[PDB]
Paper text:
Here, we report the first crystal structure of an ecdysteroidogenic regulator encoded by the Halloween gene, noppera-bo (nobo). nobo encodes a member of the epsilon class of cytosolic GSH S-transferases (GST, EC 2.5.1.18; hereafter GSTEs). DmNobo forms a polypeptide homodimer with a canonical GST fold, which has a well-conserved GSH-binding site (G-site) and a hydrophobic substrate-binding pocket (H-site) adjacent to the G-site. Consistent with the requirement of GSH for GST function, a defect in GSH biosynthesis in D. melanogaster also leads to larval lethality, which is partly rescued by the administration of 20E or cholesterol. These data indicate that the nobo family of GSTs is essential for ecdysteroid biosynthesis by regulating cholesterol trafficking and/or metabolism. In general, GSTs catalyze various reactions with an activated glutathione (GSH) molecule in the following three ways: GSH conjugation to a substrate, reduction of a substrate using GSH, and isomerization.
GSH and EST binding did not affect the overall structure of DmNobo; the root mean square deviation (RMSD) values for each pair among the four crystal structures were comparable with respect to the estimated coordinate errors.
Residue numbers in the entry:
A (entry chain AA): 3 to 228
B (entry chain BA): 4 to 223
The structure:
């Protein structure tokens, strides 16, 4: 019943997906900033709330959620009851769930491995070709999904698109989409949604933070901008 | 049409699905895909699942490529109204939150360790690094068990089935002796009839890892 509280750092793509859903559904939510690059997620009180030391973390009454994909489903079920973002029909809902788990286990995992290598080693010491292969593989899979539909999980916008677009925009700071016409079309369409504005500041903050910590510049030509 | 499960029982996410199939008496058709021979890269399997992973379930026209989606789908279709995937929203969110901890944290870190063994050889893995990453997962689970007998509340749910198989896999290398709640919970899980579905693939994974990584686990 009390309004949700979101612990967040907008540089995180999963955080941005929750910010996008909050904007799309017009949800009133208290924001509490946790600076991941300063290690504020290791403060004792935050660790007591979420021992995984991660954002987004949502506190909604007694419920404490520590994964973006649970937060997206929870907020859709509470603030979009009966809607199409988290579909009513079982098969369509399982397709969206399957895509959310692809984002967690495959796209995000590989982008996190790459970006954490940059922070830990410096960009000049990362095997960028290795990560390019891993992440281009994810682009190929997404292009294949979109060869069948204009959205990731079917013919309409779902939570899968909100979860995937933020991490895709993050991978695309580095790796261009010139060779992926369906992924370009979809990303352009997602950027026309008013809710996409919630992605913009955090993407830019992540770009700047990574350039500083990793001592490099992303190639400006890569990012798709409309 | 009955569900088809593409599987290699060495995979802990596969074992979680085998455990649920045994608990719910689901009639499935099993099709083996050998992960250590690279059969997940065969062209027909890749056409089905471009993430080249098991478990993969084909149920009618529905193709699921992640164990946590498979667990939820099978519970919804074959255990409607049961307690493994709770009806009440807050309880269900708690289960979902733990399934995603398993995917994003426990499994990710065990995968990173076990992959390192296969790629580099055990003698060349930074075991102390992986011990810190995996012990941190043990610490988190010990905290999750502070208030309840099971991972997501007072009774067995899908979260326990997902977590127990990967935990048993981490436990090939790293003992539970420092984590009393977690050790008690693991012993209780081993007493379930359905836990028998974990045993064969866990031992096969032990043997395959010891051969490929040229070592013996401490627990061996």
């Amino acid at each position: 019943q009390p309004k949700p509280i979101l612990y967040y750092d907008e540089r995180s793509p999963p955080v941005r997906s929750c910010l996008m859903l909050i904007k799309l559904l017009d949800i009133d939510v208290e924001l509490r900033f946790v600076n991941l690059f300063k290690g504020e997620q290791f403060q004792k009180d935050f660790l007591a709330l979420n021992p995984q030391h991660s954002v987004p973390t949502l506190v909604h009454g007694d419920l404490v959620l520590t994964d973006s994909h649970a937060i997206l489903i929870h907020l859709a079920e509470k603030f979009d009851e009966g809607g199409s973002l988290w579909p009513q029909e079982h098969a369509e809902r399982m397709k969206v769930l399957n895509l959310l788990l692809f984002e967690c286990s495959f796209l995000f995992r590989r982008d996190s491995d790459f970006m954490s290598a940059i922070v830990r080693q410096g960009f000049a010491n990362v095997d960028v070709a290795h990560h390019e292969r891993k992440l281009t593989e994810a682009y190929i899979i997404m292009e294949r999904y979109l060869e069948n539909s204009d959205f990731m999980a079917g013919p309409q916008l779902t939570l899968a698109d909100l979860s995937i677009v933020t991490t895709l925009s993050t991978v695309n700071l580095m790796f261009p989409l010139s060779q992926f016409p369906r992924l370009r079309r979809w990303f352009t369409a997602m950027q026309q949604l008013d809710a996409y504005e919630a992605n913009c500041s955090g993407l830019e903050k992540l770009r700047q933070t990574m350039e500083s910590v990793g001592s490099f510049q992303f190639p400006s030509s890569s990012a798709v901008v409309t």
